[PDB]
Amino acid sequence: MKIEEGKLVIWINGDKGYNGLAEVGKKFEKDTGIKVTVEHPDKLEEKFPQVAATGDGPDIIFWAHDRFGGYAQSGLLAEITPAAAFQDKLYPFTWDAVRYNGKLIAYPIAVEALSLIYNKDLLPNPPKTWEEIPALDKELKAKGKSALMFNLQEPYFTWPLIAADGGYAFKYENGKYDIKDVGVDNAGAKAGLTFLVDLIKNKHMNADTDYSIAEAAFNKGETAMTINGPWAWSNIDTSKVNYGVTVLPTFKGQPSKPFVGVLSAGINAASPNKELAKEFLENYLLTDEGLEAVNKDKPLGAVALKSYEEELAKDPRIAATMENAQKGEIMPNIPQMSAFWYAVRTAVINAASGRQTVDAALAAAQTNAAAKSSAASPAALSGYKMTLLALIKESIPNQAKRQKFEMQVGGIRNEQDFKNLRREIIRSAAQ
Numbered sequence: 001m002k003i004e005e006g007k008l009v010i011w012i013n014g015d016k017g018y019n020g021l022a023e024v025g026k027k028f029e030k031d032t033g034i035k036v037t038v039e040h041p042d043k044l045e046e047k048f049p050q051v052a053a054t055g056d057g058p059d060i061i062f063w064a065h066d067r068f069g070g071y072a073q074s075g076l077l078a079e080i081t082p083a084a085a086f087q088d089k090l091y092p093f094t095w096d097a098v099r100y101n102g103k104l105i106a107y108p109i110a111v112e113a114l115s116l117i118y119n120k121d122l123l124p125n126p127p128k129t130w131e132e133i134p135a136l137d138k139e140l141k142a143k144g145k146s147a148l149m150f151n152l153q154e155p156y157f158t159w160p161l162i163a164a165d166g167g168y169a170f171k172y173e174n175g176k177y178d179i180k181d182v183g184v185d186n187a188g189a190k191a192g193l194t195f196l197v198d199l200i201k202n203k204h205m206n207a208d209t210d211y212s213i214a215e216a217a218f219n220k221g222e223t224a225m226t227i228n229g230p231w232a233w234s235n236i237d238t239s240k241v242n243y244g245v246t247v248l249p250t251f252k253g254q255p256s257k258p259f260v261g262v263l264s265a266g267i268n269a270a271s272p273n274k275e276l277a278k279e280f281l282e283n284y285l286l287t288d289e290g291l292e293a294v295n296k297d298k299p300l301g302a303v304a305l306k307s308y309e310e311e312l313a314k315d316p317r318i319a320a321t322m323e324n325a326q327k328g329e330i331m332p333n334i335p336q337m338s339a340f341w342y343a344v345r346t347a348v349i350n351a352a353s354g355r356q357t358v359d360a361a362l363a364a365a366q367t368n369a370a371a372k373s374s375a376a377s378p379a380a381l382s383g384y385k386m387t388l389l390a391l392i393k394e395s396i397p398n399q400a401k402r403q404k405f406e407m408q409v410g411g412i413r414n415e416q417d418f419k420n421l422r423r424e425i426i427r428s429a430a431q
């Protein structure tokens, strides 16, 4: 289905404040007459690239920033054009998360970091260390409860522990990521995953626990602690559990190092509604009133808009969010992040199951994370890229098409990639 002109379709994850976003959409419609439809499809981070590659999909995509370099390199994202005066309204550290190869590729919305969330009735003082959690579990088990439940199906939640004593995604030096140097199989990563697997082997956690199961257990007062982000606070408030949000536990005397996400909004390169999307994002969503509507539905975290974050940062739950963020890393946004996350997802699930050792799981993850296709020689690759750039500038009269094709040129790695992109450019017809 072609993207409808004179309408905005927005995709956002189902754990986010989509109903509040729809309220901002209602205001946009009141003022402009343009309908805004918000959807939250399953497997969004996969659905978007698959559908947008066909030239279709939502006008606006929301996800954490880590996936956006890959979307941009695939030609799925428009270059955004915020004026300096608009840029000044948002924190510089959030703009840096949505810059790729020298250009802005999305609008930053809010900073997400995992925290330890604990039930103050069950546990007045939260543990400072991971190592003390088995003993805590033993006492809570005696009471028919447990110490800790969190999602073991998404490696986002386990990463802070894997990273604590030295695990890393890609080596980051001189401001550049070396995609051949993956750190998921070093001593630190092994130690962190081993600790997780031991918690499971010793019946302090269950490998099958997912988002829904952990949330229900915490929100029904069955488990003393969970690990989650700001979006989860709404449902805890509803449950009336008396909870705190705090610094993650240390492991081997090192802070846990969560990978920090910036919820970001990109504009589909194929959208015929780029100006409407800019108007909605800049002048409806990224305002005190817009962010309040979304935040009241599900908390966004530490919002990128200075004027509204001034108020939200009073909250100790936001202070704890940023305490954790400061101990972790803003995620890379490079295209290889998808392969990294696949590799670690697989390793955590397989090791947690008890059917594969940690060392075997992480050895495979190291190989899986760095996997890439054949490379042309550097000389040949530069010649292909320069050919395509000149071809695009000569032959593609539509600006958005030129801009997306030039981003695609950045991702070619070999002669086959060159030939395929050449075919895409030559086949292009009147817009």
Ligand SMILES: OC[C@H]1O[C@H](O[C@H]2[C@H](O)[C@@H](O)[C@@H](O)O[C@@H]2CO)[C@H](O)[C@@H](O)[C@@H]1O
Pocket: 013, 015, 045, 064, 065, 066, 067, 112, 154, 155, 156, 157, 229, 261, 341
């Ligand atoms: O588990 C890997 C997954 O981690 C991150 O996804 C987070 C997302 O950032 C949060 O906004 C929240 O929704 O939970 C997700 C984990 O289920 C990465 O952003 C994502 O790319 C990656 O696959």
